[PDB]
From a paper:
The N-terminal truncated HSP90 (MC-HSP90, residues 293–732) containing the middle segment and carboxy-terminal domain was crystallized in three different forms, C2221, P21 and R32. For the C2221 and P21 crystals, obtained under similar conditions, the protein solution was pre-incubated with cis-dichloro(ethylenediamine)platinum(II) (cis-DEP) and cisplatin, respectively, before crystallization setup. All crystal structures were determined by molecular replacement (MR) method, but only the C2221 and P21 crystals were refined to 3.0 Å and 3.05 Å resolutions, respectively, with three and six molecules of MC-HSP90 per asymmetric unit. The refined models of MC-HSP90 in the two different space groups of C2221 and P21 contain nine independent polypeptide chains in total. The P21 crystal has three open-form MC-HSP90 dimers in an asymmetric unit, which assemble into a triangular bipyramid architecture being arranged in a right-handed fashion around a pseudo 3-fold axis. Based on the observed 3D structure of MC-HSP90 determined in the P21 crystal, the sedimentation coefficient values of MC-HSP90 at dimer and each oligomer states were calculated by using the computer program HYDROPRO, and compared with the experimental values from the sedimentation velocity experiments. The atomic models of monomer, dimer, tetramer and hexamer yielded sedimentation coefficients of 3.7S, 5.7S, 8.8S and 11.9S, respectively. These HYDROPRO predicted S values for MC-HSP90 dimer, tetramer and hexamer models were similar to the experimental results. The agreement between the calculated and experimental values confirms the existance of MC-HSP90 in these oligomeric states.
Residue numbers in the entry:
A (entry chain D): 297 to 349, 360 to 394, 407 to 552, 556 to 613, 631 to 698
B (entry chain F): 297 to 349, 358 to 395, 408 to 552, 557 to 614, 630 to 698
C (entry chain E): 297 to 348, 358 to 394, 408 to 611, 631 to 697
D (entry chain A): 297 to 349, 360 to 393, 407 to 611, 631 to 698
E (entry chain B): 297 to 349, 358 to 394, 408 to 611, 631 to 698
The structure:
């Protein structure tokens, strides 16, 4: 019966919401609507203030059911409220309208720039889960997403904003996943993008890994991970092509040294200060997902790499060159969020180096 | 507490009800009583305003809660009742059920005395009274009095079986009913023509449960209910009839032979006026209506009808005629549709129809 | 053990099968394979002789894990019984191999026409259910369909077979759906096509309705229901001009019948699929056919009833007999075409009147 | 967040308790504390007014679990409330909740009037806890309250039982049985009562169960008065009186043991009888009369037993002496709360005794 | 297969039985039948050798498996039956009716083998009795299967049919007593006079019996009557209701005196027609709770010395203290004897001690 009129007050909605759910605080938002034509039903739906750790079904004002899956998808299982149908699985249509209507509410929630943070803080996970599952609403959900970026400082921003700041000739949305904003932001992988004023999205939640599988483009701009092989930057490929064949020798030398530990050793287009890093194949598991393969990129303009090619052009079968190459690889792994096959040998390799720094 | 005093206000009862059942509206009716001697217990029972859909009466023993659901505390047909039972003894709850049932029936009867507002109760719970007629053998008579039906004499009102009996003719020994899908379906059905013509009142049972309910409702005030869609309909001048039976006796045998194993007998009707014939079913088999919710059929013929009068003249004078064969089967087939059965093979029925049109046209 | 060997007698497979399923007879078919590389597993799968969510047992390193793994085999292949034994703790890759191999097995069965009857009798339902659900396989599946037709008599044929026998002026595959082969082979709908030796596929399973939705064409030819409005058939010029003289000859009668029939029917058109029947009811291009778990009256220009009706109607368009007779044609045509009557009792009273007319 | 303030009116506490439990009346008691340091958490706990025929857990105001089988020990499962925490290691929360409940119960006890309300409903649990909770056994036993032979209609504590003990009284005497009237008037408590030695009347079933772990109270052992060898304060050489009587009836005892064959294990001169001629006590371990083995103590100062001594010695084989001994035995069984292995025989025996008392 | 031939050997049925149910031993009996007309189905039903502790008949349609646990197919009391039903078409209330018909047919055929019926009856008598309670329709056919020890029967269990054959000319009732054991019921106060006169009493000595005789009201039109309820009717109308009518009014005084002393503890005190050697007993009301089940009349023996001399003592002053103590004692021991419990044993004891003091000096 409250489900039945309109211009109910906020306090009235609150009370119904509270008695319905045993919540001690009132609803964060409400969406209250009816449908006409084929099916006729009214829905009253609440967004709770806190994320959980169902909706009641009526036919003509008589209670039918509590737990009814099929009514609303799992990624929207936080929604509480009532659905009162007029009739007697075609309620698949009810599901389609409820999902239309929540999404509308979320969009409405998103227009209040200042207070969306409340909803988003709590339910970003569910939006993300939905991107994965709800193929038909992947676009409209993608517009609800918000991320920290290398341009965004302390604010989380929309992919729409990201696109506004895109360069003339930027075809790709760049992102990185990891544990913390600071870990990814100081990561080797973003050094060069970040130097040239390219914006990288910092995806720092575990779902994020799961979600980017499915989020393949936004506004016709494809997302690419700055931790996978073959980074496309937006002329000066001649500058690049020269460095590639300059270090082709050293690449072939390091690859043979590392044998089965990497698939390739290439010349980087993504490093500034770090000498090298470990990127992964486009289709394999990432370093961030391996918790629960590998190319090694070298920085042509780094001085450790620069003197390594000298040392390795003149004599490849050296004991020091081998040991120096492995060490780079090993530390690069650690740095790219991988774990060592055997840390004790890595340790001993470091003590050898330490001794060479110290006399005898 | 609330289950414990008296001269509680309606508002108090309502708030209690609402909390007990998470209903948004208060109760339609309330019965709050107590029992001495044998067992000691108090009961507060509510009738909701709207029917639901494992009973729902909370059992307490000395103000402490024991059970939410307790089969045996009240029969299934009364399961819409919501309320509390508080016993003082309890470790023989047949004693509780009997008093619970006694008191509801009483409440219902008081409801029935308020003519205007009985409709509210009845609209919602007549299903349950009818179910009880089927189940509760001991209270079958009392439940029968709470029943209400549309009749051929009642127009737009539902009337009681008591009112029905008040208007029975002098020599009428039977209450007549028909079961069907809607009010208009049964009222214009073949089976009430003659009864209706002679001002005999027919109860129109138009809900599915009615079929289940009349299995057990055999009489009311010592008058037996008889369905008007069954064989051997007895009416309240029998020699007028007996002439007509022996006159059309011949035709019946020729028709039955043409119809072979589709009908058991072909008989002369006592129930038709404007219709040439109908399909009545044996006293013991499933009704026609009880198949719309998914034998044996008799075909009754109308002695007074023109079609039958001149199909007799056609069948004395030669019984092997092809068109007489065709005419008999087509009466039988349409008689089936009419009586709410289904055609075994529709395609052949249509070709049968088209053949008879080719004839009513000259071709 | 049994899932490891491979020169294993049919008796040994049958024995395993019965103990696995508590069936009393052996299997109809067996498929026993292994898979290398990506994932390492063995499957041994059985087709039961009688048609009975899924019941494939999952083993890891000869240790029993699960009995009901919903992800292992698609819903439409749930009659498959047997075991998957793996070498390591995704399932999409297993599923992929299970459906590949079943389908392979099914095609091997299809080779032996004698034995494929036994299979298809029991599981054709599932092959159709699959055309509906599993689209990556729809094409392989549709080659396994077999239907009775108007030229197959007592054996079921495939669509490939149906296409070879087509006239090459014929663009469409014809089908009718209904309850029983006898019901459909005799319907007004197939009269003219059957006289022309044009082949109609008889589709006498409830699922066929479900399935023809998805099976929109075969080998570039579109399937057309013979129950639906506007049926196109080989239109020789000698003929399709004959169809226009009749068309206009009964132009007035069609209008007069539409008028009498008011809201019960959408158009009264002159027919092109009737030989001996005076008329039939066709449904609209989309929107429920007669098969229920939109309306056109087509009249037959060469049927004496229709020929006479034209004369009586064009003599006096408001004859109460003409009206009555038209509604009787309509009603009986509803009955033919698989519909129920909105008021049986009125149809009866109409029939009594027609009887009275052909008698005095 | 009612579980947060602490200027809370009882009205507000009650309103919360009712919404939490759907009870009609408010709480009997409320304990509402917080914990600082190790783990941080707040608890709001209620003692309902009527025993049932549990605890909601929130973490940082988020509902996690309604039923958590570790939060509170099983005997305290009547406590209704919420625990809200900062994060099995619920061990530590448990500990605290049981500490604070006992703290509260102790406080309820100090308010003599109202504790009776509490102890009526929950004594059962308190005893159930005596059985299970060894760490809190002593503290729980201080809550216990019993009818005694010196308490009237009032129930009294064990601490109060002890203040009235003679200091030569070593033991705390108890009797378990069905009703107060029944135990108070039993033959077992006759002489203790006469001496003014206090007997605890335990009349609940659980009491049998509880005394199995409640062995002492303030270093004073609990003896059942229903068991063999009762020890009571033996004034100087009153025990030398009890040794004359002992040898006086040494012979009678031997005879009755013979007569009683295997029904009874010993016949002894009682030290617990004033007016009853005899009684059946059970052995130190082995089922008491509360069966949900046997000695027969005779009263050396009862006229029946004194006469029996004379008849029995004059002639140990008299059938009247036999019949009289069996009858004494049987009626003593009935008194002591056992059943007769053959009532119809005992009946017949009585009929002979009646024919004797009358002369036929 | 197995459920479609016939002249299948026993070893075959046995093998099928074992595999179907995981029993180590083969079936005690088997019933394999088929049905036409309404529905068509075949049924293969086994009686196990041992009683177990939902039913389990496997339901097949056209030889494919459908359902293990299928209630409604066979009534609860017949849930020991294991086996298979293969229906040709699928109002399975019909199937149930035939299943039950054919089980009873099998039981009757078992009962025809006097010596070996014991094997079945030992295990399943409970289930038969449960049926008598539940299956109103088959109550008669089921009653024909029951067997009981009777006062006539010594060490054998007899049918009610045989009971009826031995009835005296003028005996209108079948007499029963229910109790814990044969020796207890057989030597009870309540059967003395019936037994003296050659009237057969059925000894019902299992708890289900109490439950069973509620519904088992007659047999061969002869009504069953408990010997522990008020108003026992004997056939003795040998013009000797006058004999009985004498004693009735002869002890009318003593009866009313005893009733006043016994106050609310008995409904009435009457002169008995069922005692020989006992002085009195406690019968219960025709409608209340029996004794054997955890309103009382006190019947008194008009021919017993104790009761003969108490009538003297009662007329010679009713108000006497010892008369009061003696009446309560008879009542009390009568209670224990008739299988009730004493409300307060300590006072019964103290009463006994007083009387013992009389017997002795004191």
């Amino acid at each position: 019966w409250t489900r039945n009129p309109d211009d109910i007050t906020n306090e009235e909605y609150g009370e119904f919401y509270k008695s319905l759910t045993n919540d001690w605080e009132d609803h964060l938002a409400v969406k209250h609507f009816s449908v006409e034509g084929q099916l006729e039903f009214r829905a009253l739906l609440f967004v709770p203030r806190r994320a959980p750790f169902n909706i009641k079904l009526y036919v003509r004002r008589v209670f039918i059911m509590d737990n009814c899956e099929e009514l609303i998808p799992e990624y929207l299982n936080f929604i509480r409220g009532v659905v009162d149908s007029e009739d007697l699985k075609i309620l698949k249509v009810i599901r389609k309208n409820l999902v239309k209507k929540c999404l509308e509410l979320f969009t409405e929630l998103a227009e209040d720039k200042e207070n969306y943070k409340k909803f988003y803080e709590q339910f970003s996970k569910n939006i993300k889960l939905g991107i994965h599952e709800d193929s038909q609403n992947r676009k409209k959900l993608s517009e609800l997403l918000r991320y920290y970026t290398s341009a965004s400082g302390d604010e989380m921003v929309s992919l729409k904003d990201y696109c506004t700041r895109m360069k003339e000739n930027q075809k790709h949305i760049y992102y990185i996943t990891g544990e913390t904003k600071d870990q990814v932001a100081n990561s080797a992988f973003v050094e060069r993008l970040r130097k040239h004023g390219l914006e990288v999205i910092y995806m720092i939640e575990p779902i994020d890994e799961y979600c980017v599988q499915q989020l393949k483009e936004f506004e016709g701009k494809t997302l690419v991970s700055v931790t996978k092989e073959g980074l496309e930057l937006p002329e000066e490929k001649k500058k690049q092509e020269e460095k590639k064949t300059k270090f082709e020798n050293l690449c072939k030398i390091m690859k043979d040294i590392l044998e089965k530990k990497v698939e390739k050793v290439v010349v980087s287009n993504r490093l500034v200060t770090s000498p090298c890093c470990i990127v992964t194949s486009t289709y394999g598991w990432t370093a961030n997902m391996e918790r629960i393969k590998k190319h090694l990129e070298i920085n042509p303009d780094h001085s450790i790499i620069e003197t390594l090619r000298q040392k390795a052009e003149a004599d490849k079968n050296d004991k020091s060159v081998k040991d120096l190459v492995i060490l780079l690889y090993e530390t690069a792994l650690l740095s790219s969020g991988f774990s060592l096959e055997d840390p004790q040998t890595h340790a001993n390799r470091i003590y050898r180096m330490i001794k060479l720094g110290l006399g005898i």
